């Protein structure tokens, strides 16, 4: 399962 | 023994002829098993053991995650473009993360990002910190070290990642533990008085292989030239190894192939 | 770019009579590596070659050692000195021979 | 850096036996790349491009393959175009 | 066994701005060798590989050097620093890769 990210 | 789960992703300002600008893909034990891109907009299966063991809610949730990350990196491209004071051109954001269950049975997890093909920022899980590789990553580090996002990433790379890897490995136990025997061809060409022997291994699986030349019984450590391990279009792999010699010593060279699909190493001659 | 280190990032010196794990992550793992130890004097000692199939080869041509363990773990190569003593002191290097070129990892000092 | 290109068949070629011709480019950057399989200077049809991938050093890779039946007296090649190259480069396939 | 050396053994130090020829006596002269240099720091550098066909291999897969020459003549191997500078100072070693095992010459210091 893919994970969630945050903005650069 | 060894099992790997890895997700990689690329956003590009210049994807090239025929290409979508955002593409993320996943691999289990080196095998591409899921794929998403900015044109299809939908996370899709890529093997028959992941499709046979996944519902639609799995794929819709993976698609929502992939769309969230697609615009995260859409924003990130512009953010970094003028963080570097750049006015357009060719730029690339890359990310790769995942986990490994190694042959000694311990687990490792990783996550790292690159800008324009160079290390941008990496995750030090142990410290729960973000190591900046460039000054321009000191900013992102702060943004990534606020709240609990770092601890969520640790928990993903240590728990979520590893158990989903275990389940994927169970799903495709037959297919990933399969073994395909390579066929080895020994060829030879004479150019300007130098005889060059080629050894080609076609269609082997898994990817780990050891191909060596032997001259009168001894491995030629420093004389072999190799193209590395290259992929076939069907989940198998290929490799070629050349060596130079004098004509007349040509029948003393043996190509030795070590691969899991061989109970004993294969010895082939010209 | 390639470097050998203690697998335990807290370790600062080996300890007499006990196992020492060193490790090296090559830039390319379609090839084996070779572990070597350099004295302070400078003489270099071959320890073992580890193939991409986690196949290990020590001095003579043996695959069995009282004294070292080699292995491939994920994308890393691993050396274990089962019982580290004074003769095992030195700077430990990792060496990848790819395409007739030699590549040297960073040295890891290991002294009491 | 510049792409490294290999042209090889999926099985050892024999004239008349069906096979797949592959052109693999690795270790290049930026991801933009043009790769075309050719027989006798003409682009082959039914050609496919693997999705964009990269390896541990962030360098990119692409595989292009096409089903075909080898014929001696006909030359097979792969044409590569990349920013780091002044001009296109053409890699001949050796049937062996 | 193998020794990488000054081809003139009366010579005790290289000479600034002039070619420096080192030479290497292998245990077996049916195999190529590799010339390396060890820095003041202790860092190792690959210089050239010389095959039994007197064919050499330079860094990032070349056979073109505007500052080195490799070849094998009679029963010995030759490394030539075309123009020995302070940039080239260090201890020069020889490396034989036979049967996936590494053999190291004793080594020749080369400092002004």
Residue numbers in the entry:
A (entry chain C): 1 to 8
B (entry chain A): 4 to 273
C (entry chain G), E (entry chain H): 8 to 119
D (entry chain B): 5 to 100
Publication passage describing the model:
Critical molecules involved in immune defense can be subject to an evolving molecular arms race with all kinds of pathogens, of which the most famous has led to the multiple loci, high allelic polymorphism and high sequence diversity of major histocompatibility complex (MHC) genes. These genes encode the classical class I and class II (aka MHC-I/II) molecules that bind antigenic peptides and present them for recognition by the T cell receptor (TCR) on T lymphocytes bearing coreceptors CD8 and CD4, respectively. TCR and CD8 cooperatively bind to the peptide-MHC-I complex (aka CD8-pMHC-I), which amplifies the peptide discrimination. The CD8 dimer exists as a glycoprotein on the T cell surface in two isoforms, CD8αα and CD8αβ. Of further interest is the fact that only the classical class I gene BF2 is expressed at a high level in chickens, and chickens can live or die based on whether pathogen peptides are bound and presented by the dominantly expressed class I molecule, intensifying the selection for appropriate CD8 binding.
In this paper, we determined amazingly high affinities between chicken CD8αα homodimers and pBF2*1501 compared to mammalian CD8-pMHC-I interactions and derived cocrystals of chicken CD8αα homodimers with pBF2*1501 and pBF2*0401. The current study determined the structures of chicken CD8/pMHC-I complexes for the first time, namely, cCD8αα/pBF2*1501 and cCD8αα/pBF2*0401, which each contain complex A and complex B in an asymmetrical unit. cCD8αα binds to pBF2*1501 and pBF2*0401 in an allele-dependent but peptide-independent manner, as demonstrated by the CD8αα-pMHC-I interaction in previous studies. Remarkably, cCD8αα binds to pBF2*1501 and pBF2*0401 in complex A of cCD8αα/pBF2*1501 and cCD8αα/pBF2*0401 in a novel “face-to-face” mode, which is distinct from the antibody-like binding mode of the known human and mouse CD8/pMHC-I complexes. In cCD8αα/pBF2*1501 complex A, the corresponding residue Gln222 only forms two hydrogen bonds with Asn102 on F strand and Gln105 on CDR3-like loop of the cCD8α1 subunit and forms one hydrogen bond with Asn102 on F strand of the cCD8α2 subunit instead of the conserved C strand that located on the deep of CD8 cavity in humans and mice. Furthermore, Arg207 is located on the BC loop of the BF2*1501 α3 domain, which is absent in the interactions between CD8α and HLA-A*0201 and H-2Kb, and no residues of the BC loop participate in the interaction in humans and mice. Moreover, the “face-to-face” binding mode leads to the loss of most hydrogen bonds and salt bridges between the CD loop of BF2*1501 and BF2*0401 and cCD8αα. However, more water molecules contribute to the interaction between the CD loop of BF2*1501 and BF2*0401 and cCD8αα in complex A. Importantly, the MHC-I α3 CD loop (residues 220-228) has been proven to be key for the CD8αα-pMHC-I interaction.
